[PDB]
Amino acid sequence: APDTSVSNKQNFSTDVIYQIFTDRFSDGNPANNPTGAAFDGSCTNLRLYCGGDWQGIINKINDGYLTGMGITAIWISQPVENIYSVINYSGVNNTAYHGYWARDFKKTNPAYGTMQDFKNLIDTAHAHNIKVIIDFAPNHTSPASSDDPSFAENGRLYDNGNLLGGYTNDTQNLFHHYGGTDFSTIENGIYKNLYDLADLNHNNSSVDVYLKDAIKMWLDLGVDGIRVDAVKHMPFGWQKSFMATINNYKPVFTFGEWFLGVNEISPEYHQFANESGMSLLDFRFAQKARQVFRDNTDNMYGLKAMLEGSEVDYAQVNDQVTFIDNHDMERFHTSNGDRRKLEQALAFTLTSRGVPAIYYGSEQYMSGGNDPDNRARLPSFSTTTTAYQVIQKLAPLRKSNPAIAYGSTHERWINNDVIIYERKFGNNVAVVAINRNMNTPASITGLVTSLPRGSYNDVLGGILNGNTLTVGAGGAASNFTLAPGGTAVWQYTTDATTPIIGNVGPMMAKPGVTITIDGRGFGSGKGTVYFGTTAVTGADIVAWEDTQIQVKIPAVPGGIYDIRVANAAGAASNIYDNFEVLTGDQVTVRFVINNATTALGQNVFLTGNVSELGNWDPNNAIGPMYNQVVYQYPTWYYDVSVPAGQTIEFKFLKKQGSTVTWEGGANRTFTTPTSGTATVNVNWQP
Ligand SMILES: [Ca+2]
Ligand SMILES: [Ca+2]
């Protein structure tokens, strides 16, 4: 099927996502509304249920509100049954309207709809070429106090109606009991509770298996993507085995939320997007876009540097989900803010690299501060706002112009208030000019583009004061004045003759799994796919057409490979690197080592004989290990994803700067479980 098909669950760069808080969008079924203290039909107490549900989203797909705007994916609240309690937090009553306070991951939240209503949403969305992404929040259940078992539902977890356990008297240790996090360290935010939420214990085999069985159920119901909540607050090692479960079963686009503030760049955040098997909400993009287009705390050179630097820091930048606001930020549009600021930021996001997400009601110019004020009911379903028309015009270009879906980004002209960038993929081009100064026109002289000669009409039709671009010989444009607040988009598409890979999904899986390679110029006839120097041809290529190849991963050693395609004529593509072939199915094992004393700056790491443990290379060793919450120094511990059902060999080592101290003695061996978790508890061997 083509790369733009709704059946492409692996890659979303050709899509535009509309993020919906289900409760705040449309009440299509009043009979499923909560009653009593849990409900507020006027939606003026923003912490109660207002009534929005899955029938309301079905109605807005059917009547053309969502499809008229060019939306091709919706991202909805977690679908799972939540606690029914109205919790009073110092006078204010609070309900689970947001879907984050789960009690049974195998059932539906009835305020949103039945399981038949969820299937009707999936089938209605897919009949209209809309993909469905769901939130999934496996870090916790709901508010709980083990001291007071009567508070809320005591964090209880059920498995399809059957109670597994509560937070008080947790004799099976389904939950963590280390107190609440102060967010001082990543280790501290993982194993301690976020606020009062009962933290799930993923080292318990019952919890591990239950959450993996629950996500497969939702994949079986046909969801096309998953947004994982609180990825900074769960063990990396457990999240990599969770991703391997999804990818080796039914791979779908998965991304997580790791918040970053203004000007914060975190190595760990980049490491997680590059190695977990999931991508991330692009906070680095969002925060700089708000600084340049909203708050005016940086200028176009800051925008340029973010686009140039993130193309490099993210190993797969086309998989990062971009946005200008969402449920964890104040709405971009302010009361005294020019609406043109919101319209340009949306045009910038829709034509930029990655997977664009628009927070519901942006097209209706909703303003509001932080939670819960950024989650009001949307006030109007008017299809004639300028912002609705901007999305309507630009969102289709992700499906039709591969330079917007996959292309590189090149700044062609800039000054403090103007940027003109080009997106390029093969011979497909898009050029975008934006002037954020609302008072001053900009004289553009010397603009050179990759556009063929012609008179290109603004795709926005002049609604944000854009103009025609006349391109002469050698891509040189005739000089023009860019209007105050002007934004224009010019483009040119054609066929690729050379294979060019724009995106691959999933990026981590074991041998035998089918991966999806998207791009242009592959040809109709079946060619060759290279994983390193290994050629995959013939029947192992499940499908080949010009924009998409589906191929089985060859039985190669675990490790990281470059992918390259050669069409039937032997013309080869660009390399798409960093593909991780796993040794096999994964399980998370907790490694615990006692009596490992260290100097300042020296930490303990683990390596071993499989790719998942870095294949004996100290530079790729797992760590640094933790030593504060579950176990305390000089005992160190870490949860590591490791191949299931086999004997691995390993050693611990201490590293400080460039010095590696290996423990002495013979290599350690351990036979891993086939499912569930395991703990290895050993003593440092001098
Ligand atoms: Ca309802
Ligand atoms: Ca946690």
Just give the CATH class of the largest domain. Answer: Alpha Beta
* Count of helix runs: 12
Going by CATH, what is the homologous superfamily of the largest domain?
Glycosidases
- Spatial separation of the terminal alpha carbons: 58 Å
Structural class: alpha+beta
Largest sheet: 8 strands, parallel
Content of β-strand: 25-35%
Shape assignment? globular
PDB class: glycosyltransferase
Keywords: transferase, glycosyltransferase
Assembly: monomeric
Entry title: cyclodextrin glucanotransferase
List the helices and strands and how they pair.
Blueprint: E1 17-20, H1 54-62, E2 73-76, E3 80-82, E4 87-89, E5 92-94, E6 102-108, H2 115-127, E7 131-136, E8 140-143, E9 157-159, E10 162-165, H3 186-191, E11 197-199, H4 205-220, E12 225-228, H5 236-249, E13 253-256, H6 267-275, E14 279-280, H7 283-295, H8 300-313, E15 321-322, H9 339-350, E16 355-359, H10 386-394, H11 397-400, H12 402-406, E17 408-414, E18 418-425, E19 428-435, E20 442-444, E21 454-456, E22 469-471, E23 480-482, E24 487-492, E25 500-505, E26 508-509, E27 514-520, E28 528-531, E29 534-536, E30 541-544, E31 548-552, E32 559-566, E33 576-581, E34 586-594, E35 603-608, E36 636-643, E37 647-656, E38 659-662, E39 668-671, E40 678-683
Parallel strand pairs: 1-2, 1-16, 2-7, 7-12, 12-13, 13-14, 15-16, 26-33, 34-40
Antiparallel strand pairs: 3-6, 4-5, 8-11, 9-10, 17-18, 18-19, 19-24, 20-23, 21-22, 25-27, 27-31, 28-29, 28-32, 30-31, 32-33, 34-36, 35-37, 37-38, 37-39
Helix pairs in contact: 1-2, 4-5, 7-8, 7-9, 9-10
The chain binds calcium ion (2 copies).
